[PDB]
Ligand binder design. Structure first.
Ligand SMILES: [Mg+2]
Length: 381
């Protein structure tokens, strides 16, 4: 019998893991990456998934689909859907029974997709990278979802799994997968109160769990669906756009889709450098109109650019505690999930809020969800 895979089907990035040899192996894609963009693109001659899809986003905005997780199992007239639609370059139309229909151009014809068909292609890609890595067919999988996902959203995710040819053994909550990764369910007798602080690329989720006799109870959830790592990267982009203007007689790089994409990717990298170093250099040759660009950014400058965002990560933490009627002193574990939790200011605010309590951060924060999903998949296989 073949191994079962744990899949973190993320908003901006997807990650897959396999339990083997006393650990979880995070599956590398074609390029050797441990995470894959949740992107699908359609051209006159082909479809592209992940990296190849994200790499051409600048050239093909109308037919490059992303954020399908925000649409999955939702209805067209839903307030979150109409609001999200205003920031998507791709067309979203009303289908029969109020289902959102993604409309793109593919192979010279108009083609329509349901959000689960787009997530199915991301899952199909997660299956293919696993098959190449493990040298065999993979069908069994555990797929993760946010704890706030309703029945329709879970069912639509299960259907994306089926379309991809995966037998979805279980749909588990992302904070539960994270608790499993840290073995928080195996600490002993009595209640273990866990706070999962999940700051992803696109969404911010705080979940308060209670683990008793190995049973996971979601007591409360809160966050901001529109606060993520990309928002911090965007503040650097904005800084860099304005800095280029003053260095280059008011020239606006935002009018060139490629220049803006290039600069954004470099701001993502700089933000990552500023999580370990106190300064970063954004350097881009022939960025806009043959003009090279270079700027040095201190950690302090970056923190000042994202000041309002830092003030906002504690509000959901206070909310879950209030909603569950729990004192912060009762929290046994504070688990950090998502690359942006690497940000020193973010780590320092949480630790401070929990009166100096050290957080659970040992597991790669971009891989912790796939880690627990892989553990759960090995248990069910
Ligand atoms: Mg994400």
């Amino acid at each position: 019998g073949g191994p079962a895979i744990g899949i973190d089907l993320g908003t901006t990035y997807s990650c897959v893991g396999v339990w083997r040899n006393d650990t979880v192996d995070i599956v590398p894609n074609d390029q050797g990456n441990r995470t894959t963009p949740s992107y699908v693109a359609f051209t006159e001659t082909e479809r592209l998934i992940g990296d190849a899809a994200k790499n051409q986003v600048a050239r093909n905005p109308e037919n490059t689909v992303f954020d399908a997780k925000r649409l999955i199992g939702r209805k067209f007239d839903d307030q979150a859907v109409q609001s999200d639609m205003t920031h998507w370059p791709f067309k979203v139309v009303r289908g029969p029974k109020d289902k959102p229909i993604i409309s793109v151009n593919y192979l010279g014809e108009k083609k329509e997709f349901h959000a689960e068909e787009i997530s199915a292609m991301v899952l199909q890609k997660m299956k293919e990278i696993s098959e190449a890595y493990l040298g065999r067919q993979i069908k069994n999988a555990v797929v993760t979802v946010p704890a706030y996902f309703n029945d329709s959203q879970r069912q639509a995710t299960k259907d994306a799994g089926a379309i991809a040819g995966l037998n979805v053994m279980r749909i588990i909550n992302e904070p539960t997968a994270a608790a499993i990764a840290y073995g928080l369910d195996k600490k002993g007798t009595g209640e273990r109160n866990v706070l999962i602080f999940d700051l992803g690329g696109g969404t911010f989720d705080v979940s308060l769990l209670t683990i008793e006799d190995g049973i996971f109870e979601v007591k409360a959830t809160a966050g901001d669906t529109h606060l993520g790592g990309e928002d911090f990267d965007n503040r650097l982009v904005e800084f860099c756009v304005q800095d280029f203007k003053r260095k280059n007689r008011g020239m606006d790089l935002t009018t060139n889709a490629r220049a803006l994409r290039r600069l954004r990717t470099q701001c993502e990298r700089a933000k990552r450098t500023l999580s370990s170093s106190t300064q970063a250099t954004i350097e881009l040759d022939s960025l806009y109109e043959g003009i090279d660009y270079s700027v040095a950014i201190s950690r302090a400058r970056f923190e000042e650019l994202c000041a309002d965002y830092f003030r906002a990560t504690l509000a959901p933490v206070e909310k879950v505690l209030k909603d569950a009627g729990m004192d912060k002193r009762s929290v046994h574990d504070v688990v950090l999930v998502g690359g942006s939790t690497r940000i020193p200011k973010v780590q320092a605010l949480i630790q401070e809020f929990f009166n100096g309590k050290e957080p659970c951060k040992a597991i790669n924060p971009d891989e912790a969800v796939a880690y627990g999903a892989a553990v759960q998949a090995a248990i069910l296989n």
